Amino acid sequence: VIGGDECNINEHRFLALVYANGSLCGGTLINQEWVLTARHCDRGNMRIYLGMHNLKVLNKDALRRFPKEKYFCLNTRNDTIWDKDIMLIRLNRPVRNSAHIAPLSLPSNPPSVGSVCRIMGWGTITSPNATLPDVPHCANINILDYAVCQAAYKGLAATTLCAGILEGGKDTCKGDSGGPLICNGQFQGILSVGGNPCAQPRKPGIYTKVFDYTDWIQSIISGNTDATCPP
Numbered sequence: 093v094i095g096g097d098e099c100n101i102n103e104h105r106f107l108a109l110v111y112a113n114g115s116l117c118g119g120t121l122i123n124q125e126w127v128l129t130a131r132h133c134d135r136g137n138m139r140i141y142l143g144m145h146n147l148k149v150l151n152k153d154a155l156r157r158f159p160k161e162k163y164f165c166l167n168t169r170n171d172t173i174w175d176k177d178i179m180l181i182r183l184n185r186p187v188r189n190s191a192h193i194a195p196l197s198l199p200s201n202p203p204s205v206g207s208v209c210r211i212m213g214w215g216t217i218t219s220p221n222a223t224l225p226d227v228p229h230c231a232n233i234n235i236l237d238y239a240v241c242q243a244a245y246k247g248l249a250a251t252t253l254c255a256g257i258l259e260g261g262k263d264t265c266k267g268d269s270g271g272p273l274i275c276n277g278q279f280q281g282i283l284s285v286g287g288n289p290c291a292q293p294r295k296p297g298i299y300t301k302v303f304d305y306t307d308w309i310q311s312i313i314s315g316n317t318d319a320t321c322p323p
């Protein structure tokens with residue numbers, strides 16, 4: 093996250109730290125056994141950490157988990173960038189609520205353009221040139237008119253939200269992918285892609301629009317037929 097500050101230690105109890113072969117991502121604990129992240133974060137040998145804040149001062153209740161079930165969309169396009177960038181993972185063992193662990197459930201509605209959203213992650217705090225923080229950084233951004241992202245990014249995937257600061261300065265960045273966009277207290281986005289360098293004017297973040305995936309998520313977890321992702 094560029095342009096933010098250290099998250100409050102208690103404000104991200106649902107935030108998962110996802111490490112995979114040569115890669116850092118975030119994710120979101122949506123219940124006691126399941127995490128949503130970006131499918132592009134699945135780079136192999138995934139380890140998912142819950143209840144983490146400082147990477148160097150381990151919370152007493154921090155936990156390591158592994159994928160036991162893994163789902164993503166099979167109706168993606170190839171002509172848009174990272175279409176349906178979402179992956180639903182069941183953890184190998186559940187995680188109970190604790191000081192630093194609690195799920196964030198599914199949104200009741202998508203967020204209005206203009207909504208203030210929180211972004212967070214352990215991704216780079218500088219762009220260009222990686223500077224990885226020990227603690228997750230957080231910033232407030234806004235849901236932007238989708239046309240802003242359409243203007244910035246030819247080949248933008250559908251089922252996404254455009255979010256950032258129109259003037260730039262605050263943004264997610266490399267390493268924050270998979271992490272949540274929280275607007276009006278609701279889990280609304282999973283960071284997928286955005287401009288590099290990050291935090292550029294009119295080059296916002298593209299977040300998979302969680303609301304659109306509610307039924308898919310529920311179908312998968314509640315017994316899964318061969319559930320289909322939203323078109």
Ligand SMILES: *[C@@H]1O[C@H](CO)[C@@H](O)[C@H](O)[C@H]1NC(C)=O
Pocket residue numbers: 170171
């Ligand atoms: C889809 O496009 C990506 C680049 O956007 C490319 O890496 C990939 O090979 C394409 N899929 C096919 C047809 O192999």
Ligand SMILES: *[C@@H]1O[C@H](CO)[C@@H](O)[C@H](O)[C@H]1NC(C)=O
Pocket residue numbers: 220221
């Ligand atoms: C880091 O990358 C960017 C260009 O991609 C630039 O600021 C710089 O030349 C590189 N290294 C540093 C820190 O000088």
Ligand SMILES: *[C@H]1O[C@H](CO)[C@@H](O)[C@H](O)[C@H]1NC(C)=O
Pocket residue numbers: 113114135136137
């Ligand atoms: C890390 O992930 C890459 C790509 O998925 C894979 O080639 C490699 O085997 C993984 N690391 C190991 C040694 O398991």
Ligand SMILES: [Cl-]
Pocket residue numbers: 164165166167319320321
């Ligand atoms: Cl599907």
